[PDB]
């Protein structure tokens, strides 16, 4: 399922509620087209991979999450598991989300 | 307003 993180509070809780399944985060800006342009994919995987958890973050309204993750280029895909980080990669590459997810699945 | 850094989505390639 998908989950929107509007505050660092929902961030950690998202990982804790994610259980043990993979967790890919999409640090995209709702006001920036190029980032939101990849939503028909990242958010789409929600129905193709109901076994994976997908999160969302607003680098502008949630600078608290981007601040701790020190994001400087959107979209930034960050992978977490059990509250721990395992990998990450930015740059518009929706096809990689598949290879990366099937990697640490 | 809500602006931060550059969006290197399908902007770079």
UniProtKB/Swiss-Prot annotation, chain A:
**What processes in GO biological process is this protein linked to?**
cell redox homeostasis; cellular detoxification of hydrogen peroxide; negative regulation of protein export from nucleus; negative regulation of transcription by RNA polymerase II; positive regulation of DNA binding; positive regulation of peptidyl-cysteine S-nitrosylation; positive regulation of phosphatidylinositol 3-kinase/protein kinase B signal transduction; response to nitric oxide
Q: Where in the cell is it found?
A: Nucleus; Cytoplasm; Secreted
- List the active site: 32 (nucleophile), 35 (nucleophile)
Posttranslational modification:
In case of infection, ubiquitinated by S.typhimurium protein slrP, leading to its degradation.
Where are the S-nitrosocysteine residues found in this chain? 62, 69, 73
Residues marked Contributes to redox potential value (site): 33-34
Inducing stimuli: Up-regulated by ionizing radiation.
Q: Indicate where the modification N6-acetyllysine is found in the sequence.
A: 3, 39, 94
Q: Consequence of mutating residue 70 to A? A: Strongly reduced interaction with CASP3
Is-annotated flag, keyword Disulfide bond? yes
Residues under site feature: Deprotonates C-terminal active site Cys: 26
Instruction: Spell out the molecular function terms from Gene Ontology.
Output: protein homodimerization activity; protein-disulfide reductase [NAD(P)H] activity; protein-disulfide reductase activity; RNA binding; thioredoxin-disulfide reductase (NADPH) activity
Q: So which domain of life are we looking at? A: Eukaryota
The record's keywords, sorted A to Z, are: Acetylation, Activator, Allergen, Cytoplasm, Disulfide bond, Electron transport, Nucleus, Redox-active center, S-nitrosylation, Secreted, Transcription, Transcription regulation, Transport, Ubl conjugation
- According to the entry, every stretch annotated as the Thioredoxin domain falls at 2-105
Sites bearing N6-succinyllysine, chain numbering? 8, 94
Its Gene Ontology cellular component terms are: cytoplasm; cytosol; extracellular exosome; extracellular region; nucleoplasm; nucleus
**Record-annotated disulphide pairs:** 32-35
User: Pfam families of this UniProt entry?
Assistant: Thioredoxin
Q: How does it assemble?
A: Homodimer; disulfide-linked. Interacts with TXNIP through the redox-active site. Interacts with MAP3K5 and CASP3. In case of infection, interacts with S.typhimurium protein slrP. Interacts with APEX1; the interaction stimulates the FOS/JUN AP-1 DNA-binding activity in a redox-dependent manner.
The record's function comment reads: Participates in various redox reactions through the reversible oxidation of its active center dithiol to a disulfide and catalyzes dithiol-disulfide exchange reactions. Plays a role in the reversible S-nitrosylation of cysteine residues in target proteins, and thereby contributes to the response to intracellular nitric oxide. Nitrosylates the active site Cys of CASP3 in response to nitric oxide (NO), and thereby inhibits caspase-3 activity.
Its recorded name reads Thioredoxin
Q: Which gene encodes it?
A: TXN
Swiss-Prot record, chain B:
**What is the protein named?**
Nuclear factor NF-kappa-B p50 subunit
**At which residues is a lipid of type S-(15-deoxy-Delta12,14-prostaglandin J2-9-yl)cysteine covalently attached?**
7
Transmembrane feature ranges: none
**Residues found modified as S-nitrosocysteine:** 7
Function of this protein?
Answer: Constitutes the active form, which associates with RELA/p65 to form the NF-kappa-B p65-p50 complex to form a transcription factor. Together with RELA/p65, binds to the kappa-B consensus sequence 5'-GGRNNYYCC-3', located in the enhancer region of genes involved in immune response and acute phase reactions.
Subcellular location per the Swiss-Prot or TrEMBL entry: Nucleus; Cytoplasm
Q: Which organism is it from?
A: Homo sapiens
């Amino acid at each position: 399922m998908v989950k929107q993180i509007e505050s660092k509070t929902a961030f950690q809780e998202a990982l804790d509620a994610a259980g043990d399944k993979l967790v890919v985060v999409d640090f995209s800006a709702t006001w920036c087209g190029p980032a939101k342009m990849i939503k028909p994919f990242f958010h789409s995987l929600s129905e193709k991979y109901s076994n994976v958890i997908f999160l969302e973050v607003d680098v502008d309204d949630a600078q608290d999450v981007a601040s701790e993750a020190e994001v400087k280029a959107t979209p930034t895909f960050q992978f977490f598991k059990k509250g721990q980080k395992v990998g990450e990669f930015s740059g518009a590459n929706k096809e990689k989300l598949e290879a990366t997810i099937n990697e640490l699945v | 307003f809500r602006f931060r850094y550059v969006c290197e989505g399908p902007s770079h390639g």
